[PDB]
Amino acid sequence: LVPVYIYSPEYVSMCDSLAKIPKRASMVHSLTEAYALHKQMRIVKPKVASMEEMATFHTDAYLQHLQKVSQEGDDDHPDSIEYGLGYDCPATEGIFDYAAAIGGATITAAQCLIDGMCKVAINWSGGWHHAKKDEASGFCYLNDAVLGILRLRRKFERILYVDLDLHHGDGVEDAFSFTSKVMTVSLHKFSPGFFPGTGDVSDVGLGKGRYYSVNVPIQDGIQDEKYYQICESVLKEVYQAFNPKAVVLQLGADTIAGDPMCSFNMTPVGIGKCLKYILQWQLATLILGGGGYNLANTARCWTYLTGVILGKTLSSEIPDHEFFTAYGPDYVLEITPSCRPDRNEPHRIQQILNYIKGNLKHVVI
Ligand SMILES: O=C(CCCCCCC(=O)Nc1ccccc1)NO
Numbered sequence: 001l002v003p004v005y006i007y008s009p010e011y012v013s014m015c016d017s018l019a020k021i022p023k024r025a026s027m028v029h030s031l032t033e034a035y036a037l038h039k040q041m042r043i044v045k046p047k048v049a050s051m052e053e054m055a056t057f058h059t060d061a062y063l064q065h066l067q068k069v070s071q072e073g074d075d076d077h078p079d080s081i082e083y084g085l086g087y088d089c090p091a092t093e094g095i096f097d098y099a100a101a102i103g104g105a106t107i108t109a110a111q112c113l114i115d116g117m118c119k120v121a122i123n124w125s126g127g128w129h130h131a132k133k134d135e136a137s138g139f140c141y142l143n144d145a146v147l148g149i150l151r152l153r154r155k156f157e158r159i160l161y162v163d164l165d166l167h168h169g170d171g172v173e174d175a176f177s178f179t180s181k182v183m184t185v186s187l188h189k190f191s192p193g194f195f196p197g198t199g200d201v202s203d204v205g206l207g208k209g210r211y212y213s214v215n216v217p218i219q220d221g222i223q224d225e226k227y228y229q230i231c232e233s234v235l236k237e238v239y240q241a242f243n244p245k246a247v248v249l250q251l252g253a254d255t256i257a258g259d260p261m262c263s264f265n266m267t268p269v270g271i272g273k274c275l276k277y278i279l280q281w282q283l284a285t286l287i288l289g290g291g292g293y294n295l296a297n298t299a300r301c302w303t304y305l306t307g308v309i310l311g312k313t314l315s316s317e318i319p320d321h322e323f324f325t326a327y328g329p330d331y332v333l334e335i336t337p338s339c340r341p342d343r344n345e346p347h348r349i350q351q352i353l354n355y356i357k358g359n360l361k362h363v364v365i
Pocket residue numbers: 088130138139165166167168195252254290291292
């Protein structure tokens with residue numbers, strides 16, 4: 001079964017309108033198209049999420065508020081601050097249709113996996129992992145990752161969420177904090193002052209979900225080899241302990257060298273090794289994007305990872321296409337790490353891995 005690629009011209013145009021990542025969806029799609037990768041995938045038009053689908057996670061009061069301020073773009077509603085709207089998540093006109101489109105696209109990908117249409121379904125414009133049931137957060141108005149997991153739960157009894165974004169996947173972790181049917185694994189920068197502030201290795205979930213949240217706090221400057229070593233170690237133990245039946249994988253590209261966040265120092269090759277490790281489990285896998293604020297590098301990264309999913313080696317030269325002039329100064333697909341130090345002490349990393357190994361001993365059946 002060829003991978004499913006969630007795409008429509010109207011969906012990309014809607015995603016392009018997000019003020020924090022303008023035209024990023026067009027750049028990702030047009031680069032993948034220029035490498036001719038869409039011909040090797042099953043292109044599926046996303047459905048827009050219904051109110052009832054979004055309310056599987058979000059409260060009706062939040063959804064109705066988002067719908068109301070979306071009408072005229074009311075960025076001064078008295079209740080908006082209560083719902084997390086205003087600064088990182090402004091109440092712009094049409095944002096509810098934007099949110100419902102991204103939520104629906106991830107649900108559509110999940111439904112493709114349930115129906116056996118494919119073993120891999122891709123929504124690069126998804127991955128908005130910070131939104132809470134009743135609150136926008138960190139550029140995220142709707143938590144499409146949670147919506148996709150809840151759709152997968154119609155069929156799959158154990159779902160593994162893996163979050164390789166620079167930031168802690170707090171909204172997804174919190175949504176499933178109290179359950180053992182969904183295990184969340186997040187690798188992220190963890191440093192006092194760095195958003196969202198949560199996700200220490202000691203954060204393991206709560207109640208019946210205790211030990212079914214895994215957090216790998218990492219410092220500035222990590223590069224491909226050490227990151228893969230960490231990721232493989234954790235995922236090997238998680239797979240043995242939890243035996244997931246489906247995977248949701250968030251691949252935010254704000255870890256990549258050259259991102260204005262200027263924190264990690266990864267290239268798509270290292271992220272791609274993590275992706276390959278998950279793919280060889282041969283489980284139903286839902287692929288999401290996320291952060292990524294060097295727009296050309298984010299397109300480079302997700303195009304390369306689409307190649308990985310397809311088992312294809314891509315030419316190093318960026319093909320001639322609409323956004324070719326954005327790929328300077330070198331106009332190649334490869335990304336060179338910055339000449340910055342790796343702040344990850346090997347013994348602290350090993351201590352973190354030791355803690356996680358101990359936690360996963362408690363994970364039973
Ligand atoms: O990538 C993300 C979204 C990050 C949400 C924003 C965090 C706060 C922040 O970095 N704000 C900021 C960034 C650049 C310039 C000014 C403020 N989540 O994974």
